[PDB]
mmCIF file of C-alpha atoms and ligand atoms in Angstrom:
data_model
loop_
_atom_site.group_PDB
_atom_site.id
_atom_site.type_symbol
_atom_site.label_atom_id
_atom_site.label_comp_id
_atom_site.label_asym_id
_atom_site.label_seq_id
_atom_site.Cartn_x
_atom_site.Cartn_y
_atom_site.Cartn_z
ATOM 1 C CA UNK A 1 10.297 7.588 29.737
ATOM 2 C CA UNK A 2 8.881 5.223 26.923
ATOM 3 C CA UNK A 3 10.424 2.422 29.211
ATOM 4 C CA UNK A 4 8.381 3.861 32.157
ATOM 5 C CA UNK A 5 5.112 4.930 30.412
ATOM 6 C CA UNK A 6 4.718 1.820 28.046
ATOM 7 C CA UNK A 7 4.977 -2.017 28.232
ATOM 8 C CA UNK A 8 6.364 -3.747 25.028
ATOM 9 C CA UNK A 9 4.838 -7.095 23.933
ATOM 10 C CA UNK A 10 5.316 -9.093 20.644
ATOM 11 C CA UNK A 11 6.656 -8.007 17.263
ATOM 12 C CA UNK A 12 3.801 -7.003 14.915
ATOM 13 C CA UNK A 13 3.218 -7.335 11.053
ATOM 14 C CA UNK A 14 12.921 -1.753 12.260
ATOM 15 C CA UNK A 15 11.169 -4.123 14.834
ATOM 16 C CA UNK A 16 7.517 -3.132 15.359
ATOM 17 C CA UNK A 17 6.181 -4.257 18.667
ATOM 18 C CA UNK A 18 2.643 -4.238 20.143
ATOM 19 C CA UNK A 19 2.790 -2.105 23.344
ATOM 20 C CA UNK A 20 0.347 -0.702 26.018
ATOM 21 C CA UNK A 21 0.451 2.681 27.404
ATOM 22 C CA UNK A 22 0.255 1.999 31.303
ATOM 23 C CA UNK A 23 -1.568 5.035 32.517
ATOM 24 C CA UNK A 24 -4.506 4.760 30.020
ATOM 25 C CA UNK A 25 -4.559 0.985 29.316
ATOM 26 C CA UNK A 26 -4.751 1.350 25.536
ATOM 27 C CA UNK A 27 -2.789 -0.574 22.912
ATOM 28 C CA UNK A 28 -0.248 0.748 20.176
ATOM 29 C CA UNK A 29 2.178 -0.293 17.713
ATOM 30 C CA UNK A 30 5.733 0.997 18.277
ATOM 31 C CA UNK A 31 8.344 1.101 15.547
ATOM 32 C CA UNK A 32 11.670 0.814 17.390
ATOM 33 C CA UNK A 33 14.669 2.254 15.693
ATOM 34 C CA UNK A 34 18.154 1.643 16.665
ATOM 35 C CA UNK A 35 19.985 5.062 16.333
ATOM 36 C CA UNK A 36 23.543 4.418 17.813
ATOM 37 C CA UNK A 37 25.373 3.855 14.612
ATOM 38 C CA UNK A 38 23.248 5.838 12.248
ATOM 39 C CA UNK A 39 24.869 7.781 9.450
ATOM 40 C CA UNK A 40 23.953 11.475 8.876
ATOM 41 C CA UNK A 41 21.931 10.496 5.795
ATOM 42 C CA UNK A 42 19.855 8.030 7.869
ATOM 43 C CA UNK A 43 19.216 10.503 10.759
ATOM 44 C CA UNK A 44 17.597 12.729 8.147
ATOM 45 C CA UNK A 45 15.500 9.740 6.877
ATOM 46 C CA UNK A 46 14.247 9.079 10.201
ATOM 47 C CA UNK A 47 13.516 12.790 11.069
ATOM 48 C CA UNK A 48 11.597 12.825 7.734
ATOM 49 C CA UNK A 49 9.528 9.785 8.487
ATOM 50 C CA UNK A 50 8.638 11.229 11.911
ATOM 51 C CA UNK A 51 7.710 14.515 10.377
ATOM 52 C CA UNK A 52 5.600 12.743 7.489
ATOM 53 C CA UNK A 53 3.854 10.514 9.856
ATOM 54 C CA UNK A 54 2.837 13.569 12.006
ATOM 55 C CA UNK A 55 1.607 15.578 8.994
ATOM 56 C CA UNK A 56 -0.564 12.839 7.672
ATOM 57 C CA UNK A 57 -3.937 12.637 9.536
ATOM 58 C CA UNK A 58 -6.603 10.616 7.551
ATOM 59 C CA UNK A 59 -9.239 8.104 7.916
ATOM 60 C CA UNK A 60 -7.459 5.770 5.971
ATOM 61 C CA UNK A 61 -3.890 6.066 7.138
ATOM 62 C CA UNK A 62 -2.592 4.678 10.321
ATOM 63 C CA UNK A 63 -2.114 7.653 12.850
ATOM 64 C CA UNK A 64 0.981 8.511 14.788
ATOM 65 C CA UNK A 65 0.347 8.761 18.489
ATOM 66 C CA UNK A 66 3.864 9.967 19.539
ATOM 67 C CA UNK A 67 7.494 10.187 18.643
ATOM 68 C CA UNK A 68 9.902 9.358 21.334
ATOM 69 C CA UNK A 69 13.694 10.013 21.305
ATOM 70 C CA UNK A 70 15.834 8.131 23.750
ATOM 71 C CA UNK A 71 19.553 7.169 24.114
ATOM 72 C CA UNK A 72 20.213 4.637 21.283
ATOM 73 C CA UNK A 73 16.596 4.213 20.236
ATOM 74 C CA UNK A 74 13.908 6.231 18.518
ATOM 75 C CA UNK A 75 10.227 5.296 18.997
ATOM 76 C CA UNK A 76 7.371 6.070 16.524
ATOM 77 C CA UNK A 77 4.242 5.086 18.395
ATOM 78 C CA UNK A 78 1.263 4.459 16.183
ATOM 79 C CA UNK A 79 -2.466 3.568 16.927
ATOM 80 C CA UNK A 80 -2.919 -0.196 16.877
ATOM 81 C CA UNK A 81 -5.265 -1.422 14.134
ATOM 82 C CA UNK A 82 -6.361 -4.971 14.687
ATOM 83 C CA UNK A 83 -8.004 -6.400 11.645
ATOM 84 C CA UNK A 84 -4.949 -7.731 9.942
ATOM 85 C CA UNK A 85 -3.820 -7.610 6.273
ATOM 86 C CA UNK A 86 -6.667 -6.893 3.779
ATOM 87 C CA UNK A 87 -5.731 -9.801 1.498
ATOM 88 C CA UNK A 88 -5.823 -12.192 4.476
ATOM 89 C CA UNK A 89 -9.379 -10.972 5.384
ATOM 90 C CA UNK A 90 -10.656 -11.265 1.731
ATOM 91 C CA UNK A 91 -9.834 -14.924 1.553
ATOM 92 C CA UNK A 92 -11.932 -15.391 4.792
ATOM 93 C CA UNK A 93 -15.281 -13.967 3.137
ATOM 94 C CA UNK A 94 -18.339 -15.713 2.011
ATOM 95 C CA UNK A 95 -18.975 -12.890 -0.728
ATOM 96 C CA UNK A 96 -16.401 -11.160 -2.745
ATOM 97 C CA UNK A 97 -17.178 -9.109 -5.900
ATOM 98 C CA UNK A 98 -15.747 -6.191 -7.930
ATOM 99 C CA UNK A 99 -17.982 -4.021 -5.806
ATOM 100 C CA UNK A 100 -15.939 -5.079 -2.844
ATOM 101 C CA UNK A 101 -12.644 -4.621 -4.657
ATOM 102 C CA UNK A 102 -13.752 -1.118 -5.828
ATOM 103 C CA UNK A 103 -14.452 -0.210 -2.108
ATOM 104 C CA UNK A 104 -11.087 -1.230 -1.279
ATOM 105 C CA UNK A 105 -9.295 0.600 -3.992
ATOM 106 C CA UNK A 106 -11.443 3.709 -3.220
ATOM 107 C CA UNK A 107 -10.215 3.937 0.298
ATOM 108 C CA UNK A 108 -6.479 3.221 -0.935
ATOM 109 C CA UNK A 109 -6.719 5.921 -3.494
ATOM 110 C CA UNK A 110 -8.024 8.324 -0.827
ATOM 111 C CA UNK A 111 -4.991 7.565 1.348
ATOM 112 C CA UNK A 112 -2.726 8.061 -1.682
ATOM 113 C CA UNK A 113 -4.378 11.261 -2.752
ATOM 114 C CA UNK A 114 -3.905 12.771 0.708
ATOM 115 C CA UNK A 115 -0.374 11.794 0.809
ATOM 116 C CA UNK A 116 0.195 13.437 -2.622
ATOM 117 C CA UNK A 117 -1.696 16.657 -1.477
ATOM 118 C CA UNK A 118 0.727 16.725 1.577
ATOM 119 C CA UNK A 119 3.829 16.338 -0.769
ATOM 120 C CA UNK A 120 4.312 12.704 0.311
ATOM 121 C CA UNK A 121 5.154 9.723 -2.025
ATOM 122 C CA UNK A 122 4.955 6.396 -0.252
ATOM 123 C CA UNK A 123 6.818 4.347 -2.747
ATOM 124 C CA UNK A 124 6.182 0.990 -1.254
ATOM 125 C CA UNK A 125 2.482 0.260 -1.755
ATOM 126 C CA UNK A 126 2.023 -3.313 -1.422
ATOM 127 C CA UNK A 127 -0.447 -5.708 0.359
ATOM 128 C CA UNK A 128 1.460 -6.059 3.763
ATOM 129 C CA UNK A 129 0.793 -2.232 4.011
ATOM 130 C CA UNK A 130 -2.893 -2.438 3.620
ATOM 131 C CA UNK A 131 -4.279 -3.215 7.003
ATOM 132 C CA UNK A 132 -7.959 -3.385 8.408
ATOM 133 C CA UNK A 133 -8.879 -1.187 11.262
ATOM 134 C CA UNK A 134 -10.667 -3.997 13.049
ATOM 135 C CA UNK A 135 -12.095 -7.463 12.800
ATOM 136 C CA UNK A 136 -15.582 -5.898 12.401
ATOM 137 C CA UNK A 137 -17.370 -6.130 9.077
ATOM 138 C CA UNK A 138 -16.969 -3.004 6.922
ATOM 139 C CA UNK A 139 -13.706 -1.803 8.925
ATOM 140 C CA UNK A 140 -11.664 0.743 7.020
ATOM 141 C CA UNK A 141 -8.603 -0.026 4.879
ATOM 142 C CA UNK A 142 -5.540 1.819 6.371
ATOM 143 C CA UNK A 143 -2.367 2.558 4.839
ATOM 144 C CA UNK A 144 0.844 1.674 6.857
ATOM 145 C CA UNK A 145 4.634 1.930 6.764
ATOM 146 C CA UNK A 146 6.176 5.255 5.641
ATOM 147 C CA UNK A 147 9.616 4.007 6.156
ATOM 148 C CA UNK A 148 10.400 4.569 2.446
ATOM 149 C CA UNK A 149 8.299 7.619 1.994
ATOM 150 C CA UNK A 150 9.806 10.762 0.626
ATOM 151 C CA UNK A 151 8.949 14.488 0.519
ATOM 152 C CA UNK A 152 8.268 16.071 -2.930
ATOM 153 C CA UNK A 153 7.968 19.734 -3.774
ATOM 154 C CA UNK A 154 4.662 20.003 -5.750
ATOM 155 C CA UNK A 155 4.935 17.992 -8.862
ATOM 156 C CA UNK A 156 8.680 18.082 -8.843
ATOM 157 C CA UNK A 157 10.056 14.727 -9.929
ATOM 158 C CA UNK A 158 13.555 13.463 -9.542
ATOM 159 C CA UNK A 159 15.588 10.455 -9.225
ATOM 160 C CA UNK A 160 15.330 9.452 -5.600
ATOM 161 C CA UNK A 161 16.672 6.116 -5.763
ATOM 162 C CA UNK A 162 15.482 2.491 -6.003
ATOM 163 C CA UNK A 163 12.996 1.735 -3.267
ATOM 164 C CA UNK A 164 10.118 -0.713 -3.140
ATOM 165 C CA UNK A 165 9.076 -4.239 -3.666
ATOM 166 C CA UNK A 166 9.884 -5.802 -7.157
ATOM 167 C CA UNK A 167 6.436 -6.765 -8.352
ATOM 168 C CA UNK A 168 5.080 -3.340 -7.555
ATOM 169 C CA UNK A 169 7.963 -1.295 -8.963
ATOM 170 C CA UNK A 170 7.201 1.247 -11.864
ATOM 171 C CA UNK A 171 8.817 1.415 -15.306
ATOM 172 C CA UNK A 172 10.508 4.795 -14.436
ATOM 173 C CA UNK A 173 12.027 3.721 -11.436
ATOM 174 C CA UNK A 174 13.378 0.525 -13.209
ATOM 175 C CA UNK A 175 14.743 2.839 -16.002
ATOM 176 C CA UNK A 176 16.576 4.874 -13.416
ATOM 177 C CA UNK A 177 14.588 7.970 -14.547
ATOM 178 C CA UNK A 178 13.168 10.940 -12.593
ATOM 179 C CA UNK A 179 9.921 10.018 -10.784
ATOM 180 C CA UNK A 180 7.437 10.975 -8.118
ATOM 181 C CA UNK A 181 3.734 10.735 -7.324
ATOM 182 C CA UNK A 182 2.779 8.493 -10.218
ATOM 183 C CA UNK A 183 4.765 5.541 -8.892
ATOM 184 C CA UNK A 184 2.129 5.169 -6.200
ATOM 185 C CA UNK A 185 -0.667 4.942 -8.823
ATOM 186 C CA UNK A 186 1.309 2.266 -10.738
ATOM 187 C CA UNK A 187 1.517 0.201 -7.521
ATOM 188 C CA UNK A 188 -2.147 0.821 -6.981
ATOM 189 C CA UNK A 189 -2.827 -0.572 -10.481
ATOM 190 C CA UNK A 190 -0.964 -3.823 -9.618
ATOM 191 C CA UNK A 191 -2.923 -4.107 -6.267
ATOM 192 C CA UNK A 192 -6.254 -3.621 -8.217
ATOM 193 C CA UNK A 193 -5.313 -6.324 -10.781
ATOM 194 C CA UNK A 194 -4.587 -8.754 -7.763
ATOM 195 C CA UNK A 195 -7.748 -7.598 -6.065
ATOM 196 C CA UNK A 196 -9.751 -8.567 -9.179
ATOM 197 C CA UNK A 197 -8.191 -12.022 -10.100
ATOM 198 C CA UNK A 198 -6.019 -12.993 -7.152
ATOM 199 C CA UNK A 199 -2.708 -13.029 -9.102
ATOM 200 C CA UNK A 200 -0.088 -10.554 -10.103
ATOM 201 C CA UNK A 201 0.098 -8.786 -13.547
ATOM 202 C CA UNK A 202 3.908 -9.247 -13.549
ATOM 203 C CA UNK A 203 5.523 -12.364 -12.370
ATOM 204 C CA UNK A 204 8.815 -14.237 -13.224
ATOM 205 C CA UNK A 205 11.082 -16.547 -10.877
ATOM 206 C CA UNK A 206 13.934 -14.559 -12.424
ATOM 207 C CA UNK A 207 13.520 -10.975 -11.567
ATOM 208 C CA UNK A 208 15.656 -9.405 -14.334
ATOM 209 C CA UNK A 209 12.908 -11.042 -16.540
ATOM 210 C CA UNK A 210 10.148 -9.593 -14.296
ATOM 211 C CA UNK A 211 11.681 -6.042 -14.644
ATOM 212 C CA UNK A 212 11.701 -6.343 -18.421
ATOM 213 C CA UNK A 213 8.013 -7.028 -18.294
ATOM 214 C CA UNK A 214 7.174 -4.016 -16.125
ATOM 215 C CA UNK A 215 9.457 -1.883 -18.297
ATOM 216 C CA UNK A 216 7.499 -3.179 -21.251
ATOM 217 C CA UNK A 217 4.102 -2.781 -19.177
ATOM 218 C CA UNK A 218 3.402 -6.353 -20.635
ATOM 219 C CA UNK A 219 0.302 -7.652 -18.767
ATOM 220 C CA UNK A 220 -2.965 -8.988 -20.178
ATOM 221 C CA UNK A 221 -6.320 -10.030 -19.121
ATOM 222 C CA UNK A 222 -6.444 -13.773 -19.913
ATOM 223 C CA UNK A 223 -9.555 -15.758 -20.422
ATOM 224 C CA UNK A 224 -11.496 -17.301 -18.637
ATOM 225 C CA UNK A 225 -11.282 -15.247 -15.541
ATOM 226 C CA UNK A 226 -11.086 -11.916 -16.941
ATOM 227 C CA UNK A 227 -14.085 -12.465 -19.356
ATOM 228 C CA UNK A 228 -16.552 -11.889 -16.470
ATOM 229 C CA UNK A 229 -14.546 -8.751 -15.271
ATOM 230 C CA UNK A 230 -16.377 -5.590 -16.337
ATOM 231 C CA UNK A 231 -14.632 -3.364 -19.114
ATOM 232 C CA UNK A 232 -14.910 -0.322 -16.671
ATOM 233 C CA UNK A 233 -12.520 -2.196 -14.158
ATOM 234 C CA UNK A 234 -10.177 -3.202 -17.051
ATOM 235 C CA UNK A 235 -10.187 0.493 -18.190
ATOM 236 C CA UNK A 236 -9.187 1.729 -14.897
ATOM 237 C CA UNK A 237 -6.234 -0.774 -14.668
ATOM 238 C CA UNK A 238 -5.126 0.219 -18.034
ATOM 239 C CA UNK A 239 -4.988 3.884 -16.930
ATOM 240 C CA UNK A 240 -2.981 3.129 -13.789
ATOM 241 C CA UNK A 241 -0.781 0.720 -15.556
ATOM 242 C CA UNK A 242 0.296 3.088 -18.332
ATOM 243 C CA UNK A 243 4.098 3.250 -18.760
ATOM 244 C CA UNK A 244 4.321 6.987 -19.566
ATOM 245 C CA UNK A 245 3.878 8.625 -16.059
ATOM 246 C CA UNK A 246 2.739 11.938 -17.458
ATOM 247 C CA UNK A 247 -0.016 10.159 -19.133
ATOM 248 C CA UNK A 248 -0.900 8.009 -16.166
ATOM 249 C CA UNK A 249 -4.164 8.696 -14.055
ATOM 250 C CA UNK A 250 -3.817 10.563 -10.850
ATOM 251 C CA UNK A 251 -5.463 9.602 -7.590
ATOM 252 C CA UNK A 252 -7.794 12.530 -7.934
ATOM 253 C CA UNK A 253 -9.067 11.353 -11.555
ATOM 254 C CA UNK A 254 -9.050 7.799 -10.571
ATOM 255 C CA UNK A 255 -11.443 8.632 -7.760
ATOM 256 C CA UNK A 256 -13.797 10.235 -10.326
ATOM 257 C CA UNK A 257 -13.778 7.019 -12.438
ATOM 258 C CA UNK A 258 -17.267 5.488 -12.500
ATOM 259 C CA UNK A 259 -16.116 1.953 -11.405
ATOM 260 C CA UNK A 260 -14.835 3.697 -8.224
ATOM 261 C CA UNK A 261 -17.371 6.414 -7.737
ATOM 262 C CA UNK A 262 -20.561 4.878 -9.284
ATOM 263 C CA UNK A 263 -19.791 1.340 -8.002
ATOM 264 C CA UNK A 264 -23.380 0.403 -7.028
ATOM 265 C CA UNK A 265 -24.371 0.668 -10.766
ATOM 266 C CA UNK A 266 -21.080 0.000 -12.619
ATOM 267 C CA UNK A 267 -19.099 -2.613 -10.701
ATOM 268 C CA UNK A 268 -20.206 -6.238 -10.757
ATOM 269 C CA UNK A 269 -21.901 -7.556 -7.602
ATOM 270 C CA UNK A 270 -21.017 -11.088 -8.530
ATOM 271 C CA UNK A 271 -19.152 -13.380 -6.280
ATOM 272 C CA UNK A 272 -15.621 -14.238 -7.585
ATOM 273 C CA UNK A 273 -14.770 -17.569 -5.927
ATOM 274 C CA UNK A 274 -11.775 -18.212 -8.369
ATOM 275 C CA UNK A 275 -10.246 -14.951 -7.057
ATOM 276 C CA UNK A 276 -10.634 -16.003 -3.438
ATOM 277 C CA UNK A 277 -8.825 -19.263 -4.183
ATOM 278 C CA UNK A 278 -5.927 -17.512 -6.072
ATOM 279 C CA UNK A 279 -5.550 -15.005 -3.165
ATOM 280 C CA UNK A 280 -5.150 -17.912 -1.055
ATOM 281 C CA UNK A 281 -2.412 -19.226 -3.042
ATOM 282 C CA UNK A 282 -0.870 -15.796 -3.392
ATOM 283 C CA UNK A 283 -0.893 -15.274 0.307
ATOM 284 C CA UNK A 284 0.649 -18.624 0.855
ATOM 285 C CA UNK A 285 3.345 -17.831 -1.747
ATOM 286 C CA UNK A 286 4.328 -14.425 -0.234
ATOM 287 C CA UNK A 287 4.336 -15.718 3.538
ATOM 288 C CA UNK A 288 7.050 -18.180 2.267
ATOM 289 C CA UNK A 289 9.594 -15.228 1.544
HETATM 290 C C1 5CP B 301 -2.908 -7.982 13.107
HETATM 291 N N1 5CP B 301 -1.916 -7.614 11.865
HETATM 292 C C2 5CP B 301 -1.150 -6.476 11.847
HETATM 293 C C3 5CP B 301 -1.400 -5.455 12.671
HETATM 294 C C4 5CP B 301 -0.769 -4.299 12.545
HETATM 295 N N2 5CP B 301 -0.986 -3.372 13.533
HETATM 296 C C5 5CP B 301 -0.490 -1.967 13.413
HETATM 297 C C6 5CP B 301 0.630 -1.616 12.686
HETATM 298 C C7 5CP B 301 0.601 -0.173 12.932
HETATM 299 C C8 5CP B 301 1.590 0.743 12.304
HETATM 300 C C9 5CP B 301 2.395 0.171 11.234
HETATM 301 C C10 5CP B 301 3.122 0.541 12.559
HETATM 302 N N3 5CP B 301 -0.642 0.084 13.537
HETATM 303 N N4 5CP B 301 -1.134 -0.906 13.879
HETATM 304 N N5 5CP B 301 0.259 -4.378 11.712
HETATM 305 C C11 5CP B 301 0.463 -5.353 10.703
HETATM 306 N N6 5CP B 301 1.475 -5.173 9.915
HETATM 307 C C12 5CP B 301 2.522 -4.268 9.980
HETATM 308 C C13 5CP B 301 2.703 -3.632 8.730
HETATM 309 C C14 5CP B 301 3.875 -2.670 8.696
HETATM 310 C C15 5CP B 301 4.699 -2.574 9.718
HETATM 311 C C16 5CP B 301 5.875 -1.528 9.819
HETATM 312 C C17 5CP B 301 5.425 -0.181 9.838
HETATM 313 N N7 5CP B 301 4.951 0.901 9.911
HETATM 314 C C18 5CP B 301 4.496 -3.337 10.862
HETATM 315 C C19 5CP B 301 3.407 -4.122 11.096
HETATM 316 N N8 5CP B 301 -0.275 -6.437 10.885
#
């Protein structure tokens, strides 16, 4: 079926291959899941991801086109978005300000709010899952990869397990405590910090040491580079990177923050060349692991 209706080409970003639907000619992105030796637990996980990806239709989340079960393999076929990773586009721009970073985080927070309204916690918000719709200027930021996503019942929090990328892990996950939606907003804080200065709030070559920093919530806003960053941006990072998840800002409240919703008057329009140059180094460091 899928082997008669599509043609598969190169691996994108399970394997994820760019494909073309033969009858229409349009391009897609197929997540190819080998299901021959799958434990019962993992069949439920894959059913769940498919179900999550069908449920979530939003301007800023990559859309599922189809879900195709075959012998040995399952295919989740998504719309192809062709603008690449957000962070790789930012380093290529002539102008980059807080206003631009506010615009990105706004779109990301709209994606996260929608997941959270639908009962979905992504659990692996990181740069590689933030894609641009196209190479056109002002292309939407789109959230990808719900591989690690879970379904929650309302605001019911629980220990769902370790999942996610070290630098973006929340304190409550690292303390092996009950968590839920707030872990996504922590990750969004970490992304926002990198979006403003081009390096992470938490870093250590030793990861046990990194996890201690995160559990402590020990970041700061060093001079000189944070000296020019508006206090309203720093305020928002502080509300997202709050260690107590009950006190942490929600996606709904974060979108009502003035730096996000009154960007044209609150966020700095000043070019931040040093950010762009740190991002370049950041991007280089990550594509080496
Ligand atoms: C040009 N640069 C790109 C393009 C691209 N195209 C995509 C991917 C998708 C859905 C995620 C399957 N739609 N369009 N994906 C990526 N990265 C990427 C990120 C996550 C995944 C895994 C998932 N889900 C696969 C690829 N980098």
